[PDB]
Amino acid sequence: IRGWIFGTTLDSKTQSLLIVNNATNVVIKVCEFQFCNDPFLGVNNCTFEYVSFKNLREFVFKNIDGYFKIYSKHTPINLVRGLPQGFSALEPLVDLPIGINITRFQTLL
Amino acid sequence: GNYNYLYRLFRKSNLKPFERDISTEIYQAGSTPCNGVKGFNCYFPLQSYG
Amino acid sequence: ASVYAWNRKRISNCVADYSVLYNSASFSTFKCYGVSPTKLNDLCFTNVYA
Numbered sequence: 729i730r731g732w733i734f735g736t737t738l739d740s741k742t743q744s745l746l747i748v749n750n751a752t753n754v755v756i757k758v759c760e761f762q763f764c765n766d767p768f769l770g771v772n773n774c775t776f777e778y779v780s781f782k783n784l785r786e787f788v789f790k791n792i793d794g795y796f797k798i799y800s801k802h803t804p805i806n807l808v809r810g811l812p813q814g815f816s817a818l819e820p821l822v823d824l825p826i827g828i829n830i831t832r833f834q835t836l837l
Numbered sequence: 838g839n840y841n842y843l844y845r846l847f848r849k850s851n852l853k854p855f856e857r858d859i860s861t862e863i864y865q866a867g868s869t870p871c872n873g874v875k876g877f878n879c880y881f882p883l884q885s886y887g
Numbered sequence: 888a889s890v891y892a893w894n895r896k897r898i899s900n901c902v903a904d905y906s907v908l909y910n911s912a913s914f915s916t917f918k919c920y921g922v923s924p925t926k927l928n929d930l931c932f933t934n935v936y937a
């Protein structure tokens with residue numbers, strides 16, 4: 729999974745948050761693009777921009793009316809992939825000042 | 838007149854705190870689905886101080 | 888009335904409705920001011936006038 733899109737129209741007419749985890753770095757922007765189809769494999773009024781089975785990754789995404797808050801954790805698991813019931817806690821990453829209205833989201837895969 | 842400075846006259850709901858919105862769509866005041874109709878039932882919302 | 892001699896026709900002791908007006912294309916011109924047309928139906932007055 730390369731990352732996420734969050735917004736309302738998800739392309740054109742208004743801003744929509746794009747987050748790409750581009751291998752070495754996170755890359756983030758708020759103007760729209762048509763890209764979706766296959767970025768995971770080898771084989772415009774842009775008013776904000778930012779850069780920064782045995783493993784289970786956990787995230788929380790929140791919009792606090794203002795800002796966009798992200799928490800995460802990286803956890804080891806056995807290959808029983810259905811969320812083994814061992815308790816875990818997620819820690820803050822970022823608190824981005826984006827101010828964008830959001831109702832819908834999508835996954836980059 | 839310096840018309841280059843503008844404000845949104847109305848919106849279908851009030852902003853949430855620090856919600857930022859540059860949308861240029863026609864505000865529907867009445868029954869007409871606007872589609873470029875302006876000045877009655879429908880209005881362009883970005884007014885100027887001039 | 889002739890406009891140099893315009894008339895203050897009194898309205899009193901009754902409930903108004905401006906929504907039946909602002910929804911309607913029944914006039915060669917219609918305008919409302921100071922508040923959104925939706926807010927007019929919340930107002931109260933000692934008298935109203937045509």
Ligand SMILES: *[C@@H]1O[C@H](CO)[C@@H](O)[C@H](O)[C@H]1NC(C)=O
Nearest residue numbers: 750751752753754755779780
């Ligand atoms: C973006 O993608 C290329 C190829 O995957 C990579 O070299 C680069 O380090 C990535 N990150 C940035 C910020 O360009």
Ligand SMILES: *[C@@H]1O[C@H](CO)[C@@H](O)[C@H](O)[C@H]1NC(C)=O
Nearest residue numbers: 772773774858859860861883
């Ligand atoms: C940027 O937004 C303004 C309205 O805020 C609009 O008039 C303009 O056409 C937009 N330009 C681009 C390149 O999207």
